[PDB]
Amino acid sequence: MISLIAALAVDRVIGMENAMPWNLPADLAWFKRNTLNKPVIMGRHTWESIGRPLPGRKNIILSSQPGTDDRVTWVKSVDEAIAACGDVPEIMVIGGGRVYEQFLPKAQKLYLTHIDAEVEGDTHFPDYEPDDWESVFSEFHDADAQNSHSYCFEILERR
Numbered sequence: 001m002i003s004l005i006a007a008l009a010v011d012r013v014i015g016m017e018n019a020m021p022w023n024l025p026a027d028l029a030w031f032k033r034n035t036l037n038k039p040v041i042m043g044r045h046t047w048e049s050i051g052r053p054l055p056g057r058k059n060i061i062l063s064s065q066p067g068t069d070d071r072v073t074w075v076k077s078v079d080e081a082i083a084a085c086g087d088v089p090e091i092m093v094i095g096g097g098r099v100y101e102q103f104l105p106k107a108q109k110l111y112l113t114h115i116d117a118e119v120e121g122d123t124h125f126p127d128y129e130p131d132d133w134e135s136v137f138s139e140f141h142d143a144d145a146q147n148s149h150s151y152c153f154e155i156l157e158r159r
């Protein structure tokens with residue numbers, strides 16, 4: 001099973017200048033809980049944005065050019081990325097925009113955080129047909145001293 005996980009601001013913005021400008025510790029905690037002990041697939045730009053391997057996860061990087069760091073696994077195509085994960089129950093695709101576009105048609109589950117924040121971005125989550133997805137979990141949270149925006153955790157499963 002392939003799943004995508006992402007945090008979306010207003011208008012499906014996911015990034016600006018290869019960064020995420022907001023800071024929501026509760027969402028990063030949700031990301032860690034849902035990805036720990038699973039393989040994570042990311043594109044090269046997202047690898048450079050994170051800046052280090054994510055501990056406790058098999059890190060697989062998509063790039064057309066040779067890898068430059070043997071602490072992670074480098075692959076050259078979508079099919080190779082999936083194969084490098086082996087026989088696991090759930091593969092997590094962690095972005096960015098171009099990678100999400102390629103894996104969306106193959107995904108059975110979306111873990112989405114909807115952040116009530118307006119930011120001027122250059123990267124968006126793919127348009128996804130709402131009729132194809134059933135919401136099986138949603139949990140709203142108001143802003144607090146640690147999290148400066150309200151946010152909604154949602155899990156969607158392909159119908």
Ligand SMILES: NC(=O)c1ccc[n+]([C@@H]2O[C@H](COP(=O)([O-])OP(=O)(O)OC[C@H]3O[C@@H](n4cnc5c(N)ncnc54)[C@H](OP(=O)(O)O)[C@@H]3O)[C@@H](O)[C@H]2O)c1
Binds near residue numbers: 016
């Ligand atoms: N809010 C969120 O949830 C979230 C999550 C992830 C990322 N982001 C943000 O998203 C932005 C990065 O997204 P992005 O769309 O620019 O880039 P990306 O999807 O991270 O990376 C694209 C790169 O991945 C490689 N790639 C992708 N598909 C490939 C394929 N089929 N075969 C081989 N290589 C492939 C290419 O690398 P080469 O050029 O080396 O071939 C391509 O240039 C940043 O702003 C980041 O902060 C946000």
Ligand SMILES: Nc1nc(=O)c2nc(CNc3ccc(C(=O)N[C@@H](CCC(=O)O)C(=O)O)cc3)cnc2[nH]1
Binds near residue numbers: 005007029030113
């Ligand atoms: N829900 C969600 N939120 C995000 O912010 C997110 N970000 C990315 C891409 N960017 C990043 C940037 C940093 C870390 C990171 O350092 N995560 C730590 C959290 C611990 C911490 O730094 O507070 C990790 O161990 O996973 C992960 C992804 C991909 N999927 C996401 N999914």
Ligand SMILES: [Mn+2]
Binds near residue numbers: 077079
């Ligand atoms: Mn091929």
Ligand SMILES: [Mn+2]
Binds near residue numbers: 086087
């Ligand atoms: Mn197999």
Ligand SMILES: [Mn+2]
Binds near residue numbers: 150
């Ligand atoms: Mn806000």
